[PDB]
Point group: C2
Chain length 88, copies 2
């Protein structure tokens, strides 16, 4: 049974975790520990990704607004200069 | 003369800024002020973009490594369970 990023969630399930309950403690607890650590790290990578995407989008929207404003300021400067007869 | 994000750098040049030096002070300083503010904000939007791109790439590389590790931990748990006869 080969695990990848694509099939992780189809294998790391409650049903499969429950199958481990039949093992004696000396095998059950190390295996459950790895299982839980895997899910916790995978879930955290999901939270990190979703937050990185949202932060990036929020930053892009606000940088677009910064560029728009800079463009408006230069447009105003060039318009005002042209009304003073400056030849660009 | 219409300014956009695409042509900003072709207009906000030293050559064009120098043309403003002929204006009397009452027109020169307000216009130069807008020109400089425009360039400063535009340059800052560039710095913000380049940094956002680099931070995103650095985060993606490290999250890929987190997912790889989570996948390795689950693989180890499932392999160990299978050696104990667990039927997934």
């Amino acid at each position: 049974m080969k695990i990848t990023s694509s099939n992780f969630a189809t294998i790391a399930t409650s049903e499969n975790f429950a199958k481990l309950s039949v093992l004696p403690k000396n095998h059950r607890e190390p295996i459950k520990g790895l299982f839980k650590s895997a899910v916790e790290q995978f879930s955290s990578a999901r939270d990190f990704f979703k937050n990185e995407n949202y932060s990036k989008e929020l930053a892009e929207k606000f940088n677009k607004e910064a560029v728009n404003e800079a463009v408006e300021k230069l447009q105003k400067a060039i318009d005002l200069a042209e009304k003073q007869g400056i030849q660009f």
